[PDB]
Amino acid sequence: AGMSLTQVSGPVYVVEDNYYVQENSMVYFGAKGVTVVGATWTPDTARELHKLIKRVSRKPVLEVINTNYHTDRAGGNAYWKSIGAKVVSTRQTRDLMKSDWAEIVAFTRKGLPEYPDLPLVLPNVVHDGDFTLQEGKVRAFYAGPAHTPDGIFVYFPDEQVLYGGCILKEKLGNLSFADVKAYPQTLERLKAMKLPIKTVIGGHDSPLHGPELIDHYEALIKAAPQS
Ligand SMILES: [Cl-]
Ligand SMILES: [Cl-]
Ligand SMILES: [Cl-]
Ligand SMILES: [Cl-]
Ligand SMILES: [Cl-]
Ligand SMILES: [Cl-]
Ligand SMILES: [Cl-]
Ligand SMILES: [Zn+2]
Ligand SMILES: [Zn+2]
Ligand SMILES: [Zn+2]
After folding, report:
1. Alpha helix (H) ranges present in the chain?
2. Whose CA is closest to 116, among 44, 170, 62?
3. How many contiguous H segments (helices) and E segments (strands) does the chain have?
4. 70 is in an annotated binding site
5. What is the C-alpha separation between 37 and 91, in angstroms, rounded?
6. Residue 200 Cα, ligand 3 centroid: separation in angstroms?
7. How far is the CA of 191 from the centre of ligand 6 (A)?
8. How far is the CA of 183 from the centre of ligand 9 (A)?
9. What residues pack around ion ligand 9 (CB closer than 5 A)?
10. Is 94 helix (H, G, I), strand (E, B) or coil?
């Protein structure tokens, strides 16, 4: 299908969004409603995700997290706002989105001319630090710059699942925005947290991995140009 939504553990589901360059995002089905992690590529893809969510739960979509300011993590924002879902990010992500959205949309359209010229839609719930949702069962944190300066991790302690967003994935990918020297330093700060991790969800390529995805990408990035 163009998009799938599949349980990985309990209330934690993975979205494989096959539009444009495949991106993987998360959904958490909570007591009071649904938290989406990664807004997906466009308002149309967001609508496609919402359609899958409505086949699983009647509960409202409470909030959507932009794990960085880029199109693959924030492009759905217009749709999520339109349905009354909060759009959540760190202050850093919101500030970079305000200044650099036009730039990332233009860069997106270089590779994907078919991608729409989306207007800026900023998060409306902004956090100054690390933050949690769903009674502490969805935990977002900053551990330094990697694919972008602002990208955050999201951890689900009950299921021991770590969402890597654009930071963790199978192939090196494009490094145009990346801090290549800091990248492994961020991954090592992450490892030093010693979070219990059974599953890492990569934000591109095939999503389901073990904790060794962190080590896999770390070795890749340490070999890259500008490392
Ligand atoms: Cl329901
Ligand atoms: Cl439910
Ligand atoms: Cl353009
Ligand atoms: Cl990121
Ligand atoms: Cl592998
Ligand atoms: Cl694996
Ligand atoms: Cl791996
Ligand atoms: Zn990006
Ligand atoms: Zn990405
Ligand atoms: Zn793997």
Report:
1. 43-54, 71-74, 77-82, 91-111, 182-192, 212-223
2. 44
3. 6, 13
4. no
5. 17
6. 34
7. 16
8. 15
9. 72, 166
10. helix
Query: Annotation-wise, does 181 bind a ligand?
Result: no
| 208 CA from centroid of ligand 6 (Å) | 7
The C-alpha atoms of residue 70 and residue 118 are separated, in whole angstroms, by 12
Resolution of this deposited model, Å: 1.7
Return the DSSP state at 166: G
Is 18 flagged in the annotation as binding? no
The answer to the question of whether 169 is labelled as a binding residue is yes
Domains of the chain, first to last: 1-227 (3.60.15.10)
Nearest to 209 by CA among 199, 196, 219, 218: 199
Spatial strand order of the sheet with 199-201 comes to: 131-133, 138-141, 153-156, 161-163, 199-201, 208-209
Report the DSSP beta bridge partners of residue 61. 34
Can you tell me the distance from the alpha carbon of 43 to that of 30, in angstroms, rounded to the nearest whole number? 23
Q: What is the residue whose two structure tokens read 């500030």?
A: 95
The response to whether 166 counts as a known ligand-binding position is yes
Experimental method: X-ray
The ligand placed nearest to the CA atom of residue 58 is 1
